[PDB]
Amino acid sequence: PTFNPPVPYFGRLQGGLTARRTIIIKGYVPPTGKSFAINFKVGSSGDIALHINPRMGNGTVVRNSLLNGSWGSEEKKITHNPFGPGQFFDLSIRCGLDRFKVYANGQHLFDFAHRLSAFQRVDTLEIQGDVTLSYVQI
Numbered sequence: 830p831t832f833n834p835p836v837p838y839f840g841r842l843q844g845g846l847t848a849r850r851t852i853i854i855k856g857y858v859p860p861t862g863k864s865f866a867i868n869f870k871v872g873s874s875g876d877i878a879l880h881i882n883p884r885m886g887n888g889t890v891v892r893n894s895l896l897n898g899s900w901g902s903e904e905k906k907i908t909h910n911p912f913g914p915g916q917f918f919d920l921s922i923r924c925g926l927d928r929f930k931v932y933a934n935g936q937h938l939f940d941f942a943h944r945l946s947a948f949q950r951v952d953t954l955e956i957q958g959d960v961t962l963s964y965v966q967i
């Protein structure tokens with residue numbers, strides 16, 4: 830469902846992941862949470878074009894890709910962490926031509942350049958772990 834979807838969330842992306850297409854994830858980080866992930870995925874159990882992994886322990890926002898069975902290099906740099914314990918967040922993820930463009934609460938969070946080149950192949954949004962979702966628009 831679009832409203833209060835229970836985690837783990839599986840929502841399929843109509844026509845594949847198109848360019849110009851924005852996904853909205855509004856949610857809540859529990860105080861007793863350590864890790865959650867947002868996965869843009871080729872098939873229900875395949876390649877992860879974009880893996881996004883807020884980790885509360887060290888307060889990192891880990892971006893990576895899982896391609897051909899292996900994790901590439903992590904990108905960690907941010908100017909802010911909206912996923913602090915007990916915080917609500919409003920994420921806007923836009924699939925661009927050369928990058929994903931990611932905003933949290935209206936503030937730019939990260940860009941992640943496509944490594945899975947043909948980003949169209951992505952057909953599965955996957956959210957898992959320590960997060961409470963209030964609204965998910967694909």
Ligand SMILES: O=S(=O)(O)O[C@H]1[C@@H](O)[C@@H](CO)O[C@@H](O[C@H]2[C@H](O)[C@@H](O)[C@H](O)O[C@@H]2CO)[C@@H]1O
Nearest residue numbers: 866880881882891892893894895900901902903
């Ligand atoms: O969903 S999982 O693939 O099972 O979880 C892993 C992912 O979040 C990837 C993304 O890069 O990280 C894996 O672990 C890392 C960890 O970030 C790093 O600190 C450590 O030194 O290397 C790992 C790989 O062995 C997660 O397990």
